[PDB]
């Protein structure tokens, strides 16, 4: 027989082929072969259900579809399935793999006695052998759960997005869990901007023992109360009183301390660790983890189970016994408990073979070697003996004041040996062996000034931790949430820290007001739990989908109504005194999907009195100083101005090289604005950076009906250039000429010839939409020779074919500022060229 195994990745195909062999043919079904519709390719409800594909009213008929370019793979798979006798669906463990397997099954057909569903947590010889020995049936319940999730997300996205376009702004999007993540980020932003840092001082003391050893302490009580001076003068007075006073070590404390290793990684823990130690965010962490799994070195990277197989435990215990030895074993395995709702059938993220060191990963990029090293170190550490520390605490008294030292000294290191700390902590030092009731001699003392920390901005990993705490999303979702909140323009990530765009605040407030049930963390958690119940087969998918859809439709039909009826409030204006360059009027501050901008109220006046003039801002970037550590965020908050009308901080954007603009955090709910001739810095447009040949200023890439065209930032100079196939940029049309007779090849358009210092190039008529460009062939210029402007005619005189009979193309020699003709084979240059030498085309090797 020949048995066909269908696997999503090609790398997974290669790795599994390593262990399957000649009897099995492995075919890589790249991604989702079958998916709900995407492109356009009571009639309103009909068009809505056709856009969705899903029809919620007609019992969720789904109309799945197979995307452009999948059909080749579908054909190949069908042919192989006709050839093969048993078809093996070896997708990954999770619901996404089950959905992919179901799609494959349903396309190929023959369901009942021809599909085996293979389940392995690692791509290794023993695991694959055990997986193929007794294959499972396709678990339709998990498929139904995945479909339920997909249907919910498409229902919410397509039904909400036109509402947000109408009320707030076109080019918004929405999503069930995405909106709740944005709500979390916006709530933390509001907590931060509300915060008003207090100020507190601290004093540090330097002492020597009678035995000449040296000790440094910190001062924490005055008059038996907490020592916390408010101002400089108070601190200086305290320092004086301290210096005058005489010090004695009235307290001597000692005690052993033990530290246990961390649990083996679940996916959220792996992302937090990779962020903290290696700096990888979420996307890089999960991409490298997926590569490491597909290569076969680590177990499946989507898990919330800390469990380990007996094989794993025995292997790692053997490794510890052989390398480290008995003191680090310890006597019995370190158990770790995952959540009761966790996929306890799954394993943790662990090495597939503990002896494979990270350096040995010849075929893994260095970042993946680092990630594997982190996984290996954690896995080894988790089973080792706890470290042992002995700790000393000292308190010293002088006058009205008491001052303290704490220190720990490290005496067995077992888990810390494999998994060291990144840096020494404040308590990772040696306090000298002062006696109980010892004496001390005194050295000069230092004050310090501090401002209370605001709540810390989310990192990608700390947001994933927050989601894991609340129960919003699941291990497979987290990377998609973290990506989509950024891609959709509600949140931005900078300094490895999360920042919330004003549009994210607007959309968050509107969605909370209208769709309070959808946005509430508890109902999101309960929905996720109900999908888990579906996967358990504790619940019926269609049922919960119907319940969701009924509630959602009630809330939508309420929300659609007019704002006086109680629907979604519009994107209300806030108004400021600035003169519109077109009509001088007062100007107001506005938010669009593009950003935050300055608008003139004539936008709301009918055509007769309409004004479309707009002014375009650049926000000030916060530049957090890594060297300031924990201070870096606090000082950023200190840097901000504060709104006159309220305690909320203010956010800053330039308007002129002479002028700078401050806007309140609760804009547009708060209408405070400030303008300062103490301006800072404004940024303009962006793209491929180019220099304008007519004025030396920066030039940037733009789109609109005549092209993806390149335009200069100097408002005094409308010099533009354009995009082409075999260069970065091309100057403007020294003589442009259309050709209806050259069709485009990637699109239905027609070609037009142009000229700049880049050379002479073809470009499609619908240029921003088509974007298609190529260099002309000499035979093409010969065919249209009559249309060519007088100067271009010589290029049609050029030799049309090289000596090999390869076809020829026209090129610019930047080293000699002249056109020449060259030939290509397989798209590569043949290394032949011909040049114009004053009426005599001449040819040779390049």
């Amino acid at each position: 027989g020949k048995a066909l195994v269908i696997v999503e990745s090609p790398a997974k195909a290669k790795t599994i082929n390593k262990y399957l062999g000649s009897d099995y043919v492995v075919k890589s079904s790249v991604g989702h072969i079958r998916d709900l519709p995407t492109s356009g390719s009571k009639d309103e409800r009909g068009a809505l259900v056709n856009r969705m594909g899903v029809d919620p009213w007609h019992n969720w008929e789904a109309h799945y579809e197979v995307l452009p370019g999948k059909e080749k793979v579908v054909s190949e798979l069908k042919q192989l399935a006709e050839k093969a006798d048993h078809i093996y669906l070896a997708t990954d463990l999770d619901r996404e793999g089950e959905a992919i397997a179901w799609h494959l099954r349903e396309v190929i057909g023959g369901d009942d006695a021809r599909y085996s569903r293979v389940v392995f947590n690692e791509i290794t010889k023993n695991a694959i052998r055990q997986a193929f020995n007794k294959p499972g049936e396709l678990n339709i319940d998990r498929v139904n759960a995945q479909q339920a999730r997909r249907f919910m997300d498409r229902v919410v996205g397509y039904m909400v997005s036109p509402l947000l376009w109408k009320k707030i702004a076109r080019g918004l999007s929405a999503g069930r869990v995405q909106s709740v993540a944005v709500r979390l980020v916006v709530e933390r932003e509001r907590e931060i901007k509300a915060f008003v840092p207090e100020e507190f001082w601290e004093v540090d003391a330097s002492t020597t023992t009678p035995s000449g050893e040296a000790l440094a302490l910190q001062v924490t009580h005055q008059n038996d109360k907490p020592f916390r001076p408010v101002n400089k003068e108070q601190t200086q007075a305290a320092v004086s009183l301290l210096e005058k006073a005489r010090y004695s070590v009235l307290e001597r404390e000692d005690k052993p301390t033990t530290s246990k290793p961390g649990a083996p990684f679940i996916t959220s823990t792996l992302q937090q660790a990779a962020s903290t130690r290696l700096g990888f965010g979420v996307k890089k962490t999960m991409m490298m983890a997926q590569r490491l799994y597909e290569a076969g070195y680590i177990t499946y990277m989507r898990t919330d189970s800390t469990n380990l197989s007996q094989d794993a435990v025995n292997m790692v215990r053997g490794y510890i016994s052989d390398n480290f030895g008995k003191k680090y074993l310890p006597e019995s395995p370190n158990q770790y408990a995952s959540k009761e709702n966790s996929q306890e059938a799954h394993e943790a993220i662990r090495p597939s073979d503990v002896n494979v060191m990270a350096e040995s990963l010849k075929d893994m990029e260095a970042d993946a070697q680092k990630l594997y090293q982190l996984i290996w170190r954690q896995f080894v550490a988790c089973q080792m003996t706890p470290a042992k520390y002995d700790s000393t605490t000292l308190t010293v008294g002088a006058g009205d004041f008491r001052l303290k030292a704490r220190g720990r000294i490290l005496r067995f290191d077992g888990w810390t040996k494999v998994m060291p700390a990144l840096r020494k902590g404040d308590e990772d030092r040696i306090l000298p062996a002062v006696n109980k009731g010892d004496a001390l001699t005194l050295v000069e003392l230092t004050p310090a000034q501090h401002f209370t920390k605001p709540p810390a901005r989310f990192s990608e990993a700390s947001l994933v931790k927050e989601l894991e705490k609340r129960g919003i999303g699941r291990p497979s979702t987290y990377a998609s949430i973290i990506s989509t909140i950024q891609d959709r323009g509600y949140v931005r990530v900078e300094n490895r820290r999360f920042y919330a765009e004003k549009m994210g605040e607007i959309v968050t407030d509107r969605l909370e007001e209208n769709f309070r049930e959808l946005m509430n963390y508890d109902f999101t958690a309960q929905m996720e739990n109900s999908l888990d119940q579906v996967a358990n087969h504790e619940a019926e998918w269609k049922a919960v989908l119907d319940h969701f859809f009924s509630d959602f439709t009630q809330q939508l039909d309420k929300a659609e109504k007019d704002p006086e009826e109680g629907g979604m409030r519009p994107n209300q204006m806030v108004l400021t005194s600035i003169d519109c360059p077109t009509c001088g009027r007062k100007m107001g501050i506005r938010t669009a999907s593009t950003g935050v901008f300055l608008g003139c109220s004539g936008y709301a006046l009918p055509p007769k009195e309409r004004c479309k003039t707009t002014i375009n801002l650049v926000p000030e970037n916060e530049v957090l100083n890594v060297l300031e550590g924990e201070d870096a965020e606090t000082n950023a908050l200190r840097a901000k101005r504060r709104c006159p009308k309220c305690g909320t901080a203010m956010d800053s954007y330039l308007i002129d090289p002479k002028r700078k603009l401050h806007v309140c955090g609760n804009n547009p709910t708060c209408d405070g604005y400030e303008i300062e001739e103490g301006e800072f810095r404004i940024k303009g447009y962006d793209g491929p950076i180019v220099e304008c040949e007519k004025c030396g200023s920066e030039m940037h890439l733009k789109m609109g009906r005549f092209g993806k065209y390149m335009a200069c930032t100097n408002e005094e100079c409308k010099n533009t250039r354009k995009i082409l196939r075999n260069g970065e940029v091309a100057p403007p049309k020294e003589d442009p000429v259309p050709l209806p007779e050259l069709p485009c090849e990637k699109s239905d358009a027609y070609f037009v010839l142009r000229d700049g210092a880049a050379g002479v190039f073809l470009a499609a008529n619908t240029f921003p939409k088509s974007r298609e460009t190529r260099a002309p062939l000499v035979e093409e210029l010969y065919r249209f020779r009559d249309r060519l402007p007088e100067k271009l005619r010589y290029l049609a005189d050029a030799p049309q074919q090289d000596p090999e009979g390869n076809k020829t193309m026209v090129r610019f020699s930047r080293k000699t500022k002249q056109q020449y003709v060259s030939s290509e084979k397989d798209g590569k240059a043949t290394g032949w060229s011909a040049f114009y030498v004053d009426g005599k085309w001449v040819e040779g090797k390049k």
């Binding site: 000699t816 002249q818 040049f835």
Partner: protein, 38 residues
């Protein structure tokens, strides 16, 4: 011509060589072939 008496040699200060030069050359091009012009 210059009626020099002797010859002197020393290391080249960067400001001195920059003072010699009548311009900087920044691109590898040599001569155009369309028209024999630099």
């Amino acid at each position: 011509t210059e009626e020099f008496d002797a010859i002197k040699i020393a290391l080249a200060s960067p400001d001195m060589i920059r003072s010699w030069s009548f311009g900087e050359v920044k691109k590898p091009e040599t001569i155009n072939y369309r028209t024999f012009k630099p």
